[PDB]
Amino acid sequence: GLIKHTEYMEFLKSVPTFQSLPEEILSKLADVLEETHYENGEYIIRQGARGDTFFIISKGTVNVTREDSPSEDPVFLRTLGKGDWFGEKALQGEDVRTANVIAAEAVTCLVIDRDSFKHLIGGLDDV
Ligand SMILES: Nc1nc(=O)c2ncn([C@@H]3O[C@@H]4CO[P@@](O)(=S)O[C@H]4[C@H]3O)c2[nH]1
Ligand SMILES: [Ca+2]
């Protein structure tokens, strides 16, 4: 959350894929977000895993890295920080993780799973 509801709304509204959603849907998404914490060096997403979660960074920074084959060391792609996001295609069921996302310091993310998201957006075309 209640205290953070408005903060969560601001984070959600800043994601371009979400910024046209009805206000009520964004409010309900804010209600179902979970906060998760990670330590420096922890993989938030591991390339090659299958997952169903999308992340918005509320604290800290992460390294996005990617390996071109399983036996090759990954290469650094970019840093993401507060207000940035990653993993969105998992909400559309594209569950194959295509890059690693690794905490570069203490990180907090707001996390939405596909089931919670589909429940809230799946009725828009009906209404
Ligand atoms: N492949 C890739 N190349 C990049 O340059 C890149 N920058 C950010 N990300 C994100 O890392 C996530 C990892 O999980 P997913 O594959 S479900 O989605 C991904 C993206 O959201 C990137 N991914
Ligand atoms: Ca914000």
Task: Walk me through what this model shows.
The protein is α+β, with helices and mostly antiparallel strands and 127 residues long. It contains three helices and eight strands. It has a four-stranded antiparallel sheet. Strands 2-7-4-5 form a four-stranded antiparallel sheet, with no helix packed on it. The chain is globular, with a radius of gyration of 15 Å. The two termini are 27 Å apart. Bound molecules: the ligand Nc1nc(=O)c2ncn([C@@H]3O[C@@H]4CO[P@@](O)(=S)O[C@H]4[C@H]3O)c2[nH]1 and calcium ion. The PDB classes it as transferase/transferase inhibitor. The entry lists the keywords Binding Sites, Cyclic AMP, Cyclic GMP, Cyclic GMP-Dependent Protein Kinase Type I, Mutagenesis, Site-Directed, Protein Binding, analogs, transferase, transferase-transferase inhibitor complex. The assembly is monomeric.
Helices, by number, come to: 3
> Strand content of the residues, in percent?
25-35%
- Architecture per CATH nomenclature, i.e. the level-2 architecture: Sandwich
Q: Rough shape? A: globular
The CATH superfamily name is Jelly Rolls
Count of folded domains: 1
The string of secondary-structure elements, in order, is: HHEEEEEEEEH
Q: What is the fold-level CATH name, i.e. the topology? A: Jelly Rolls
Instruction: Report the end-to-end length measured between terminal Cα atoms.
Output: 27 Å
The share of residues in helices is: 10-25%
Give the strand tally: 8
Rg result: 15 Å
Q: Main beta sheet: strand number and arrangement? A: 4 strands, antiparallel
Biggest sheet strand line-up: 1-8-3-6
SSE-based structural type: alpha+beta
Protein name: cGMP-dependent protein kinase 1
Subcellular location: Cytoplasm
Family: Belongs to the protein kinase superfamily. AGC Ser/Thr protein kinase family. cGMP subfamily.
